[PDB]
Design an enzyme around this catalytic site. Structure first.
Site, PDB file in Angstrom:
ATOM      1  N   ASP A 137       3.531 -67.871  -5.707  1.00 37.63           N
ATOM      2  CA  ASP A 137       4.756 -67.244  -6.199  1.00 37.63           C
ATOM      3  C   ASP A 137       4.563 -66.684  -7.606  1.00 37.63           C
ATOM      4  O   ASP A 137       5.495 -66.718  -8.416  1.00 37.63           O
ATOM      5  CB  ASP A 137       5.916 -68.270  -6.195  1.00 37.63           C
ATOM      6  N   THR A 178       8.431 -62.979  -3.154  1.00 32.66           N
ATOM      7  CA  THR A 178       9.132 -61.754  -3.516  1.00 32.66           C
ATOM      8  C   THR A 178       8.308 -60.555  -3.073  1.00 32.66           C
ATOM      9  O   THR A 178       7.137 -60.454  -3.456  1.00 32.66           O
ATOM     10  CB  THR A 178       9.346 -61.714  -5.023  1.00 32.66           C
TER      11      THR A 178
END
Ligand SMILES: COc1cc(O)cc(/C=C/c2ccc(O)cc2)c1
Length: 275
Positions: A137, A178
């Site tokens: 991440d 994301t």
């Protein structure tokens, strides 16, 4: 694994909120017994086996287990863990200079300013990858400064919520990171290893140098399609005074085939970084 079940409010006072996400909120806090300051991350537990709300205990325990192993200047440290029926509360090292992301909006950085941040990120990731920990991440939101009012601020990687041990070279799980920052293997639901973090570092470097996101589309599906196709280029308007060696560093990270991508050790020996 069970955590401390005394009321956290008996031992800490909370203050300013530092961030809130899907199932977690982080609050500045102060330990009553010592006066020392921390960041309390409240993670909402899942309340049934088959619910989609809250975080599964398996996922919480993995994040805690990873945090318990790490001690490095460029990574957040874990102080204590509490729990009650509704939440697990991680008492984390306090990093209060704000996101690199907010720091970025204030400036585009010079190559020296970029490499000064980047070298700290690479050192933290080198430590993690040495322990076979993939972060999964990495993005500006998860890089926080210790003091944003010095010319070369020190940074710490936070948010180990997607991190996994990679003891067999790869892990086969979905990583809903994301879109702008995930590697093609994540987009394509392929086995994942330490290489995915190196792609994310390439994206971060591109943003640090230009202020622009290399794969960002108008919708999340466009972004993911761009990532899988490696649909990016260096816009002259943004990169005209960026060195070719900086572009070479990025180019060797934004590589679809994970086996051909630079490793963390490669990135530290690359001529743009190596002193
Ligand atoms: C929970 O959701 C979020 C979203 C976000 O953008 C930032 C943060 C901040 C985490 C954090 C951890 C430890 C610290 O010492 C300081 C901040 C949290």
């Amino acid at each position: 694994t069970v955590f401390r079940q005394e009321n956290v409010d008996d031992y800490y006072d909370t203050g300013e909120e530092l961030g809130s996400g899907q199932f977690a909120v982080v609050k500045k806090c102060r330990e009553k017994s010592t006066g020392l300051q921390y960041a309390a991350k409240f993670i909402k537990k899942r309340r049934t086996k088959s619910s989609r709300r809250g975080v599964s205990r398996e996922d919480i325990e993995r994040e805690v287990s990873i945090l318990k192993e790490i001690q490095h200047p460029n990574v957040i440290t874990l102080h204590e863990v509490y729990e009650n029926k509704t939440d697990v509360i991680l008492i984390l090292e306090l990093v209060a200079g704000g996101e690199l992301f907010d720091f970025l909006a204030e400036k585009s950085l010079t190559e020296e300013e970029a490499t000064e941040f980047l070298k700290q990120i690479l050192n933290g990731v080198y430590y993690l990858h040495s322990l076979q920990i993939a972060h999964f991440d990495l993005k500006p939101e998860n890089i926080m400064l210790l003091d944003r009012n010095v010319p070369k601020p020190r940074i710490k990687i936070i948010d180990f919520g997607l991190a996994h041990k990679i003891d067999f070279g790869n892990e086969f799980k979905n990583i809903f990171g994301t879109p702008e920052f995930v590697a093609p293997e994540i987009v394509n639901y392929e086995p994942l290893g330490l290489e995915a973090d190196m792609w994310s570092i390439g994206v971060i470097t591109y943003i640090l140098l230009s202020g622009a996101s290399p794969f960002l589309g108008d919708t999340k599906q466009e972004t993911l399609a761009n990532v899988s196709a490696v649909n990016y280029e260096f816009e002259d308007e943004y990169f005209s005074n960026t060195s070719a060696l900086a572009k070479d560093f990025i180019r060797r990270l934004l590589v679809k085939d994970p086996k051909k991508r630079m490793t963390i050790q490669d990135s530290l020996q690359h001529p743009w970084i190596k002193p």
